[model samples]
Target chain A: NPKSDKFKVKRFHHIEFWCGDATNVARRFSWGLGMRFSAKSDLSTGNMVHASYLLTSGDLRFLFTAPYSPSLSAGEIKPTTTASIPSFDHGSCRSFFSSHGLGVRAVAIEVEDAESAFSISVANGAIPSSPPIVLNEAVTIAEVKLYGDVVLRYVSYKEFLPGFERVEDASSFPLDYGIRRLDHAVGNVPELGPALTYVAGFTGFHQFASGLNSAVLASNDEMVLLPINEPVHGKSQIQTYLEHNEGAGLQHLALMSEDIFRTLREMRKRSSIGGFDFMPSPPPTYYQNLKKRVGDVLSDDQIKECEELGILVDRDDQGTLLQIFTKPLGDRPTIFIEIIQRVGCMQSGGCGGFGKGNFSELFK
Target chain B: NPKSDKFKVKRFHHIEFWCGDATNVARRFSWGLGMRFSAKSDLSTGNMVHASYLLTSGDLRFLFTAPYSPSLSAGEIKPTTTASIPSFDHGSCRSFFSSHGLGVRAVAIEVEDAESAFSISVANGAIPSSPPIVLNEAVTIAEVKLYGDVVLRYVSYKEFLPGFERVEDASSFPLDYGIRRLDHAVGNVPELGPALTYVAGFTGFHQFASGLNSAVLASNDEMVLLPINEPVHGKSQIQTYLEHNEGAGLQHLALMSEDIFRTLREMRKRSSIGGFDFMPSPPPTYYQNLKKRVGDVLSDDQIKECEELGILVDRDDQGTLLQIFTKPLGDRPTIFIEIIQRVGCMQSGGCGGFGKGNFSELFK
Candidate 1:
């Protein structure tokens, strides 16, 4: 039974990454992942504490930040009607980077009223990391502990956080990556029940995927999908990620693509040119039994194309899905990316299967 | 008269950078500057503590390393016929990166006998960071403090560190950088006289260039030129670099190039495609007044092309020079690059003027 959601999270505002080198990683995302450099804050912009770069693919935004100093003013932050670009104080960044090499630090949510959502979360037993902060008396933001070194941030403002100047077309592949938007961001937790209960209760998110106890959280509108899971008792990818990452953290991002073949092709070229490469394909037997496993949804030629590109095929309760995953992006095998394409199931937004069929064969 | 040198320094082995992110910076060096990926060490190679990437342009090698653990094995080190890949102990890398953001941690010198050079330097009050350590039977390596957090490394090695495997053309721009070799590496010191005497004595290096107290040191064979200077009595670029860099460190590297026009053209293209951009050109008057200033070393068309490319032209007592500098590679504006082309003075070895003519214009 669907109930009226109290906390109004508009959509995913952005995903902020605390990195060691924002400039280099920013270039990687721009040139390798087909993201456009949009906004920046650095020594030139007078944000003396750190260098921050904002990159985007259509509506999705990825922020990369690295610290140069312990503290500084917010710089030339001109408050827009919608966002609060709070200046970080103390040695928050260094410790986070030291503990978690290079991984997501925050998953910010765009809300109708950030202050209202903050009050709702706090009232619903959410332990706030900081109070609701405002800028220009209009933009409001707040944060709460999410999972291991990561925070769930709420922003009630627009464009980008203040202080960052728009890079004009703020500027390359300047490539037509068919990546439309973020499909889902995966999180690895120690326990599914506690994490899901607390996080879902605070933000009023409910299960969007069809799997029973198989984890995936979505906003009331079903636009923001955060698929999460706890490791099993024995050896597993989730457990390995938790161990190597040094703690629980965001595992991977599923980027929505319309044409998997084209996107995968472009990504392979970029990876060959020094970007993060995708994982290897399944064995021949897996592809041979693919038609029987997922039914005759994809033609023989289409399946061959998927095999060539290492794209995994599957079918959920509602529709067929095509997806692929990249290897780790940094020295630590923590975070990665998944290119996912959904077929059918428009009525229910959670259409694509996350390659559950391929996961088994991948491990085998 | 040049004195008989004792250290017997062959040439620069490599410049090792202790950075927070080796992978990203490696890409920048490869794509942005036209370096080729040659060797690497990471988790897959059994290196438990760090990820290292080796890149090169002709005779020049650049090593980028980032720490993941406090200490670990030398990792499947095969005692090469040449060098000792001594495993790093203690928390050397994190503190280095913290103290100085992305910088030259070590300027390694290739020598005929690393153990002998180590003894010589120690005998001359070098205050060695570590004693000579051998690998298998023949290889020997050691280090002594240079300036600030930087170290002077001595290696009796042929290829790279033992752990790093050659990428089998482990390879992209796969671009011909036209960067033949490292021309000279500039060091920012605290006091010129004391620093020069000590460093020069340790390595048996003497003056190669014709500058009184203007500062530059050369090896026995005059192939390894290390230009150093203390920030002067006024507010200067060197002082600014020292402050931002946190202390004395390698300030800039003048990479040797042949045809400034063609190399500059390729660099401009790469820089345009999200590489480190060159500094803005001098005022139109600077180019107009170029001929009389440098005594017509460059023709009208060449000067015009130089102006278009923002290439600075100059002339020393023995030879003509054409050079340009990039803004900064990272956030602090601590380290940068210089593209230098020498016209004559092959006999003396230190031919090209380091844009003393353009320094005034660059500052103005």
Candidate 2:
């Protein structure tokens, strides 16, 4: 069991990406996805070397970090291994952006006890980047190596920590812009066995067969679902991601929304304001035969709405799931977004539990 | 005069900033000042090295350029100096961003004929970086040396020229978000003489005293105003700009609007959406003495409104001007904004043909 009675992985705390510009990316997520500007750290906070901004949609948290400039001190962020993490050819943040171009650097996990999380994960096979920092006699935080150039961050803070000021700027969007929390995080690697085996060894998360042999590893509470992917010899989408992404890193973030129709509609409206571009709708025949493939759970209105908005529907014996994907976030066809809504589902944990029956439609 | 029968330096062309991320910077300008997303160049456009985005309103324009990764081909943008422009320690853009965070790299000046403009400017002391490129019997553009890491770009095309695709994204803000066009562009330097003399000799601009010994230079038609500021012996704002800005570069951009009250009010609402933080209001005494210093041009209502909104009023023999400045855009006290409105007077060409009577107030 990944969970002991004492320490538990609460939920996905926040996922952060290291990029060249945080202000614009933060704005994109805010206006594109309607996430609220929550907190930030920059010059005003006396962080002279780099800057970071935090945004959120309920428990769906994101952090964008960028370097202001390269300095001797900024390069002091120690690496975990001699052979695992990519080399910081220049400054840490700048080199990260150069190699990956706005890629994920950290995926923070909310933990019951940071100290125990670090100690045990290290006691197992988890290699350390930054060991747990305990301050004021309180167990603070830990960061460990995950896949290439990504870290699993163990944190306990609720809102924000030191160096990041809570942003109480006047602008307020609707309290709920449809998204509730992160459903899953998908990662791309050259080969899945190494990352999967090492991560499982440290975190105690075992494999559960999704529609995979697209297997998924989930925290004990099942709140955090991480889908691991590897390239195929043919023209698989995962291979395309690996090629553009410069080896291996996070691929896309799957966010759960209570109302997919409302969320997709609102997001489309934002496209007028430089929000996002969605994948084009599937062929007309795909819509006509949707019920036969995914079962008859979808209603006339649901199918109609899905067709009109370029949304995809999938299903398993346990339930039905509806989802839509945004095109690449930046230029390289790197990271993107998947908005999903589950109905009586949480089933196979296949496409993060529901299913990806429309997977063929996506590839096509 | 910086004008001639064959080639006249027209109004201000677009200004470009070289940073790490172009997306968020473009978003900030779009929502903060209501600039529209105009065009882009990235991987989709087969630009595999760096990325650039263009945004605009009226004739006012901005370009944000960022590097995807440093490469041998990317370094082909040849430098134009033995001493003046800073050395690009690593990659060009990365080195610039390291020395100066989110700093301006170019101030493009529109021209009737870019070929002649380039020839004459070069003939008269302006140093050449990249000579003009002509295509299909149509002359294209030129880029020349300016202060520090900045350059003076000579351009003739109306919309984007080459390599950039027009962005007709769905977004449409109110046709007029109060801002009309670029009012003035100011630059900071260590000593006024070298820059002032070199720029004057090439552009043919003469000195115009505007409440200064503070002299401002204008295009022959007075459509473009460029203010040059050097340090004072004491605690002057120009020195502070130099310190945070890493030597000489383009400073605050002053934007002209028909109605400062309407624009400022609308902009204030945007602050709730991460727009900008403005300089705080002046003391009660400043308001009490406003009418007397600038004369009885302001009504009681105007005085109260300025007080409530933190706007400053300035006057010259020719006209009255209302203005406000946003605090620094990034963490460093570097680039920012100044919104201005002129009332029946294009006098002193001070504060770009108005005045900065609030100068003392800002310094205080």
Candidate 3:
């Protein structure tokens, strides 16, 4: 018998997006995704500025950056590969698909300590994007932090973690305002299976236990691989997919909540009554199929909950998962978010397959 | 008799604010003001990213910056005083009074570089913020830019002196996407009158012709001053104002349009509305008294226009001016805008007593 102990995953602390301009990107995300712009500040380096926007309903934070220098893209840069070769191109999911010729270059994760985490990650079989190098000490903490180009960060609480902390408490003036925490983060990587192993090896973050698959609108029965995760059971998860674009660009973030139904109801009230254009309408077919396919697997109550709450669903014999994807929060398409609620029975764990289903619908 | 040539004041160019975080502030302004943010790359510096936000409408640009590192409080900075005895305290604006304390600063303007067009301004002793710095040999031009804590630049087609050619079609971007032209700018100084004179001496821009008395708000009858354009015709003329906010801080900007009604309507239609909240609604006494008091001077048509447009009217013996102020576009309350239109009178001068008058209403 499986142990009844609940599987625990840390709730998202914060989600950061690397972009050409932090301030601009943050603003775009705030308006485009209907997030509340919370606070912002200049990095001590004077070379970069970070901005944070908060999602009202969930504990979710979006970090945007504007680098004061063009060091990343302007120089004679070289490109290489990683062990996990996920599809880098996400088709139309990319906002500036034409501009990003190859795709997202990489994703960096914030962890407790770079060196310690790096070793553990590699032990877990994750390949290093680059050898970790100590970056800089923070204003508040004496311990210096490391900078790695890859998607894993060992974020120690002692140091001012670059993207997370700076955004959490930006403006010093208003003592009254409160900000929410992060829910889940999704990124587009190069190779799915290998990348999953590498990431799993490093941070101990598991890929969906059931594996990923997508529904086919064209063939009607074919399936495609999709990566999704529920960091904490009965809570939030990330659904990822690798498309052949360039490398790694943030696709979307699904900020989760225990009461998504309440949140959606509030959003509707605000738009219809309070005159807030807080939510964007998804393509109609996206919703139509969500009901037709996942209807039987879930209870009538659960199905009603999903529909009324705007919770999108997808399924296979293994089980079913609930999920949704947001539009790119900024012009560069460098960052976005996703929100997910996983029902325990799904083998295509979380919304991995479900997200792919939506993507296929979009492509069609 | 005055010359009767048309004196068009043009549209807004750029609005600059001085603060602790240039890039961060720029980002906030972009969100609040509805602007597209683009990083300015300093080629000479190997692409140092300078932050700037551009509004497609009327070439509205805002530059944010921290003049010094390790930002100090208002008390720590040296007071700016030359011709004007700069005040060290914050100004009368309620937001500044309530939160900013002091030190946020700004400079605003409408641009034209011809000496003849501004002979009276030069004769009146407009001061240049910085001695005109010439660009490299590749560019030859004449400019009469004004500077305070912030700068307003003006470049001409031909050099200001003997040898210069207009850099026409110099930039490839849609320079005037939705932009109209130069608009009136606002500036703050330590002490009052002399700061006005210093600006006059520097840029050869004059004050509103109506003088300070005509411009004071009814609440405090605070001094309002105007320097004028030399004349276009026997009856045609141009007007603008200079305000003092105790210590340096951009109180607001005044974007002008020939057809105030039509322009504002278009702006609303375009969904470019600024996000800042306004002061509390004015007391009914204000409107009631306004009709009784100005019944003789203004025709019912004019009075109704002011009421319908939500425009405030302030007057003295010389003449009455119609005006309104916008809330700060960002959370800082550090910067804002104004709109003004003068009918029979050429005087673009005054305290915009509107802000002060509405303060009690806003704060209460």
Top candidate by DockQ: 1
CA shift of A265, model 3, Å: 17
CA displacement after TM-score superposition, residue A137 of candidate 2 (Å): 3.6
Clashes of each: 5, 7, 102
Q: Report per-candidate DockQ.
A: 0.37, 0.26, 0.04
A1-364, model 2: which lDDT tens digit per residue? 3342234788888888776666656666676787888877776666555567888887888887765444413434433211111222236666677677677888888898877888889888788877776433443778888887888888864356555678763634443468988888888887788878878788877565412225578777666777788876737777767666667788888889878899999888666455676887787777778756654677776787888888888765566778889877765677888999877744334442545556665554
Q: Model 1 - which docking category? A: acceptable
Candidate 3 Cα RMSD after full superposition onto the native fold (Å) = 16.3
Quote the true-contact fraction of every model. Answer: 0.23, 0.21, 0.01
Q: Which of the two, 1 or 3, has more TM-score?
A: 1
Worst window of 10 by summed lDDT in candidate 3 chain A: A214-223
- Which scores higher on DockQ, 1 or 2? 1
Residue-wise lDDT of candidate 2 within B1-364, one digit each (tens)? Answer: 4343235877788888886666656666677777778788776665656677887877778887766544423434433211111222236777777677776888888888877888988899888866886533443678778777788888775357566677753534433467877888888888888888878777777665512224467777666777877877637777767776678888788888877887888778666454666877788888878867765777888888888888888776666778888876664577888898777644334432545556674454
Per-model TM-score, in order, reads 0.91, 0.85, 0.45
Model 3, position B260: C-alpha lDDT score: 59
lDDT of 3 by residue, A1-364 (tens): 1211111222334444543333333443343334555544443222221222232323454544322212212332223211011111112212222223112223333444545655555555555544544433531111111111224333333313343333333221121112233333444444444445444433444233223321111100111112322222231122222221223444444454444455455433322111122224445565566566766667667666665656666654555556644333322223344545555452222333445565465444
* Model 2 alpha-carbon miss at residue A356, Å: 2.6
The predicted structure with the larger DockQ, 2 or 3, is 2
- Compare candidates 2 and 3 on lDDT and give the better one: 2
Write candidate 3's Cα lDDT for B20-96 as tens digits.
23333443444343344433321112211111223333444554432211111223443321111011122222123
